[PDB]
Subunit: 400 residues, 4 copies
Amino acid sequence: HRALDVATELAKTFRVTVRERERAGGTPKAERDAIRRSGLLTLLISKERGGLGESWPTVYEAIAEIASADASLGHLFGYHFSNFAYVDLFASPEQKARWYPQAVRERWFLGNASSENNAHVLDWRVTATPLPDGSYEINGTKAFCSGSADADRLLVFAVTSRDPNGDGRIVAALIPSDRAGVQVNGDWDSLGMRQTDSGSVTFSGVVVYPDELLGTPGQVTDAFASGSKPSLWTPITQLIFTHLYLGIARGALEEAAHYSRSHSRPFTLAGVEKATEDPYVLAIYGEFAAQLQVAEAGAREVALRVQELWERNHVTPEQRGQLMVQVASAKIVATRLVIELTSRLYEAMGARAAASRQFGFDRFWRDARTHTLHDPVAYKIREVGNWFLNHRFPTPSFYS
Amino acid sequence: HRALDVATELAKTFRVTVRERERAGGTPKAERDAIRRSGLLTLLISKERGGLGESWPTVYEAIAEIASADASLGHLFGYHFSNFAYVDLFASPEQKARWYPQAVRERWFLGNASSENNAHVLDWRVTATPLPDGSYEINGTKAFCSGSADADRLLVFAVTSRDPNGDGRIVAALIPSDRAGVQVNGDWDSLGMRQTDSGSVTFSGVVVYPDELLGTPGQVTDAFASGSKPSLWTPITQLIFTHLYLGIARGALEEAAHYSRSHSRPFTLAGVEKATEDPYVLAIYGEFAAQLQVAEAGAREVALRVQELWERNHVTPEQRGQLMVQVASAKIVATRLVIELTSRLYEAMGARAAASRQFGFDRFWRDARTHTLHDPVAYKIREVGNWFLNHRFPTPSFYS
Amino acid sequence: HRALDVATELAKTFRVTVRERERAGGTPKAERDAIRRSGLLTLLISKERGGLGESWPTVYEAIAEIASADASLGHLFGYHFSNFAYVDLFASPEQKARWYPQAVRERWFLGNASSENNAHVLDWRVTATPLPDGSYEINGTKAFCSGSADADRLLVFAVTSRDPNGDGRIVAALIPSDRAGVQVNGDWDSLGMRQTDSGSVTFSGVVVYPDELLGTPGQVTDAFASGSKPSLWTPITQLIFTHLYLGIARGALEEAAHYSRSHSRPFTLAGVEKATEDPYVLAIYGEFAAQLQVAEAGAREVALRVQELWERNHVTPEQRGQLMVQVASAKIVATRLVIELTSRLYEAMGARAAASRQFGFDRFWRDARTHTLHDPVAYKIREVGNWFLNHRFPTPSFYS
Amino acid sequence: HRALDVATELAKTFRVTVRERERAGGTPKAERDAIRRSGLLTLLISKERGGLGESWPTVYEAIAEIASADASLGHLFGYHFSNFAYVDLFASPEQKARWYPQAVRERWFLGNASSENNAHVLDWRVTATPLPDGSYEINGTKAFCSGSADADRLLVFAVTSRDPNGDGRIVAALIPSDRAGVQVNGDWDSLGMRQTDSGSVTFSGVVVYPDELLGTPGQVTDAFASGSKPSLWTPITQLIFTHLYLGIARGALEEAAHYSRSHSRPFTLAGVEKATEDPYVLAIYGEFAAQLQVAEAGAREVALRVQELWERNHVTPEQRGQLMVQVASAKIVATRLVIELTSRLYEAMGARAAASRQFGFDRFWRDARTHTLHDPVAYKIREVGNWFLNHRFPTPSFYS
Ligand SMILES: Cc1cc2nc3c(=O)[nH]c(=O)nc-3n(C[C@H](O)[C@H](O)[C@H](O)COP(=O)(O)O)c2cc1C
Ligand SMILES: Cc1cc2nc3c(=O)[nH]c(=O)nc-3n(C[C@H](O)[C@H](O)[C@H](O)COP(=O)(O)O)c2cc1C
Ligand SMILES: Cc1cc2nc3c(=O)[nH]c(=O)nc-3n(C[C@H](O)[C@H](O)[C@H](O)COP(=O)(O)O)c2cc1C
Ligand SMILES: Cc1cc2nc3c(=O)[nH]c(=O)nc-3n(C[C@H](O)[C@H](O)[C@H](O)COP(=O)(O)O)c2cc1C
């Protein structure tokens, strides 16, 4: 439990300043460096390679703990492990032997540049065009590039173009953020998740060398269509999001409870002597704490299943599909819970909790309301319904 | 329909600037002056006294229309009529014969200084010390003094102190906001309702003259206990709040719909080609628009009953109680609706509606979330339940 | 108020026996005859023609009152007026001159045979094949033939076949239920609505004469698609259903409250002395009574609009579409309300309310759960959402 | 897995006949004997004592599985284990060394006579009069005596009377159901749970011998008041109820999906071609299936903790209190889930699922609606809220 103690202490520190930092937005550089010093970025790197040799259940618990104190830092930390999972699922033995000790020594905090801001989410326009000696040149602009500021390496996705071995193939690469031609645009100005640096990144003639490629071009599509082990990336990542939402929920509920204990006034018109004894205050806390207990317990079980399949040589389509259904189910419940809780808890605290903007409790709703839109919950619900009613597992992709 | 056309045009101009104004907070002086020039502040003053001679249904519709454009201006406008209602219900005919033509000629926008920030509501510390001529000296600081800035008159409440005829009796008065010793503090920095100037007002040896007093000391308490006509102030005022919530709800729905038609991207992963044809987008708009239609139609009926009883010379506790139950019911439904809709509509718009803070759609949730806490909806629910189950009307108070 | 008093007295008598009668199912002949004797079946026939010359608001109020006592009799009564509305919207002047005095003299209680049990609700197979002199022969089986038992006339729909003047045209006719070849099958055995006689009817060579046809074949298709006056039939009929749901809701809430007052035990483990003072019991009654008040007040406004347009010579598509949206909205809210209330009120009553089957409170849920499925509320929601978001009124049909 | 295979095959046979059997009510003797022959009643008896030596996780899974097929048999089975848990927690080793091999040999199916029908749940009036030889005489009538028909032993609770060492002290005993003076009244006629035989039992001069007593008089009260290991009986039992609700929920969902696949018709008015592709049908299954997955996963974690503490020699009030909070939270979520889905799934099936009573789907709602009233969920919610807000564990009792 040493790693979780480390995460708990980080979270405590972040809570002290999150109110003022998230107002300003921008890059939480000091807090990112605190995460570097903690070593937790190396949780899944083997001890032999210099990491902590820890497990996914620990990573998930740490994500929720940090997110409960600062949702932006929880998101950055969580997405680091989504990026790491992708790297680990496609990297060669040579790449792991080079990169992982380097990630330990240089304290890599990974960012990504994957999504785009085109007509729809499947309209990708960032191209990878072949060069001599096996290299590729990346051109175009990516959107929602979380952790792209102060990132040591960027996980980047592009589609092959002018490629004699096949156009339209997805290439993934891990490249230095300061590689020439990479421009992080710094245009993130959001309702919530204000310190995740999820703005755009423009690629102008950016060179990617063969030893930076994560598999051959198109390999990710073959792995997902086949149900190869890399198809675990989506359930892993969607469960990361789930833990952000449960962390935010728990942080909001605890912050509200402290306010209620120390600051709410009883509704003496109704004969209440203390707000903490009000039957309707107690019902609000009870209803949301109860849902939270069940969701947290369920999320621990699914995190253990992630670890179990992570360790297998092969995961069957049924095993992967069942995990994705469990993860989607957890994300659905956690989305509804955090969105309702962060708004309705004001009713347990009273008017003065909103009358002073500086109390800042709305940060929880703003953070949850922003992130829960990452991909539409309505279609996670449809996927679970299509599974239960029609016995169809979701189609492996970057979103399901 | 002339008055409502005037309200509609005011609201149109307010929508142009509200995003920028509400950020700054402070006093919306230009907009208050526009309301002054419109004549609508005189809606309920009889034509004989120079007013518009209009009805509460008209007032309520105008409140909801303005609130749908700018919740702070809707609140200020609405609370002006709560203040006016108190004056009308307690002032003498001679006082009205003087005050109402003056309010017309001088374009009075009324403010109030009633509530306080003590161990609980109704625990009042602003004192009224009797002077030999029948005046009172007012001392103390009032909290949540909506519309206290730029107010032509303040409706003020105090409790008697050092009073040979009984301490602790509530006195009320209508006084100039620049009476010697009145300090409007401007200490309002809130989550939402940011331009309602609901900070505090400090009374330092403020003299209130006998022709400014509204009834006799304790008369408001006696009227409450009797459930007589002056106790209509509470259902009238609670239905004003109800129309703020309905106006915010309608403004949010229409604003989101504009975004959905103009900006939302179709979820092509699921085969949808137009966001406006997405079955789940359509279901969100349908669920909330349907509830809004029913709540608005119901509110019109209650508003008609307010006007009926407003015109009566005498009102029974049974008539007032039945009206209060109907008002509480409307407020309950409007409260649930606006709080759910202003949060969940993001799910119909997509991530970019939250990713771009400057869209500013969160203003609707912030305004509704702030104001709905004025008094706890849990006890409005208990009051309707106690009536339905036990045939007990709500105990008249400043909140029920 | 005479008609409503008559309806209230009928509902009083129905409440005495409904628990016993609905167990058995089958035809409530005695109660149908009491409705015949009351004269209320003639509410919408002019006084000149021997009817009551009343209005739709009166009809809707009577439907809700009767439904609150006996949902099956409320359904039968309401469907009689849906059938009458169709007749009145399509009948020729000479048909009305003969039928309406006859309906008064003979105390007609109308039923219908319209829907079918094929692959979907558009798949009609009951045919109308030409006979000499403009007659038609009807062949096939109808489903959900409400009020088909003990009916003085049946409103029957068929599609033309082997017709030189056009196949597939919808014909409607008003015929005697004992005409040769009409077989009411008596196979209604339902979860709720158990005495509506909504079973199947089989037509074997049934002759229909020109003076029984309601307009020419295909006229209803043109009238609905063009928005001519008969397009009011659907909002009229869907608002009849809405008043069934509001009646059941009010009846269930009043029956539960009586049980709570006289039988529920206090949860003394928590220090409650009387169940009627329990804060959570009170909150259940409060939530549902509040929603019921708002829904009922709203429904009264829409009922008035039905009458206003009923008296118009021409109704525009805007007027008809806005009315249909208001009716759909009322139906959506009433549907959610009655389905939740009839199940959740058990929590305000306690285990003995379900443990003693003979209490029979589940009749309310059974009746509402059955009838609310008449057409899917999900698509009423979509219709309201398509209007709000896309400014598209519902396309007139038998369901919208 | 052997035990769960046996439970699954029992459930499969129960599904074939439940629709017909539960209509009649009365005692499901053939199915109770099948459970006797299966050996599963011995799940928690050690192999050393002739039992299966299984764990609470297995018992809970078997309870949910059987309940998904027949809620009454699931309840009888689950309450047998509540009865057994009480015996295990209070009987002496010497008693258990005799009783448990006997229960294996004679295939004992336990019932109980505990609750009463007095002014409130704390008002007990069945008395235990001490006789000079250490025996007692039991007199009075118990209510809700689940599994009292065809019971091999009854777990009976009484309060001491005529007792020189203290009246009102709770005694418990395990006695034959055919002991002279025991009259099972057979008056159970309920909305749902119709074959649980939970009617009244009358004791007339019933002798209880010293070697049948469970502990000393008042010992259960002492154990509750100290939060010691015997007070685990309540979280154990409340988690049994939770698994009944999860089982009913899963059974209802599966039955509905079979109808949706086989019988539901597409809503062609809206262009749907297959009901199983309808977006709103899919959303209903997805929402409820997702909540079920999360609740089932959380329930498994809590079941493991039950086993952990069950194996401890001593349990602290903190351990017991934390467990009770986790169990209460699971019960709250499962209660809301089962009550909502057993009613709402009709909207995914269509009207004919209710219009054909013989389909019998309402059994799920009737069973769930009946059993969830066992104790009020509002106070489970208050208990979780009092823990979260005020750090107060539930006061141990027969309900918390
Ligand atoms: C936006 C807003 C405006 C308010 N305006 C007034 C007002 O004009 N006059 C008044 O007496 N109280 C006003 N109140 C105060 C409430 O009546 C109540 O006293 C207070 O909100 C309760 O505080 P609590 O819930 O934190 O204990 C206002 C409250 C809010 C949130
Ligand atoms: C706070 C936030 C962070 C996001 N971070 C990433 C990211 O790191 N990588 C990525 O590919 N997409 C990221 N996304 C994008 C989503 O996958 C998706 O592209 C976006 O929500 C679609 O926007 P729309 O709903 O307006 O069409 C992020 C979205 C949000 C709201
Ligand atoms: C289906 C059902 C079965 C029950 N079985 C038992 C039982 O076996 N033993 C027991 O002590 N109480 C049993 N109870 C009763 C509860 O402990 C409690 O006394 C009862 O639900 C309270 O009734 P009330 O809410 O009407 O006041 C049962 C209740 C129901 C509804
Ligand atoms: C209680 C009840 C009464 C009904 N009465 C009629 C009726 O009188 N005339 C009619 O055309 N349809 C009637 N319907 C049927 C609907 O128009 C529609 O055909 C049916 O509810 C759809 O069935 P499904 O959802 O199982 O496919 C009735 C339905 C119910 C549940």
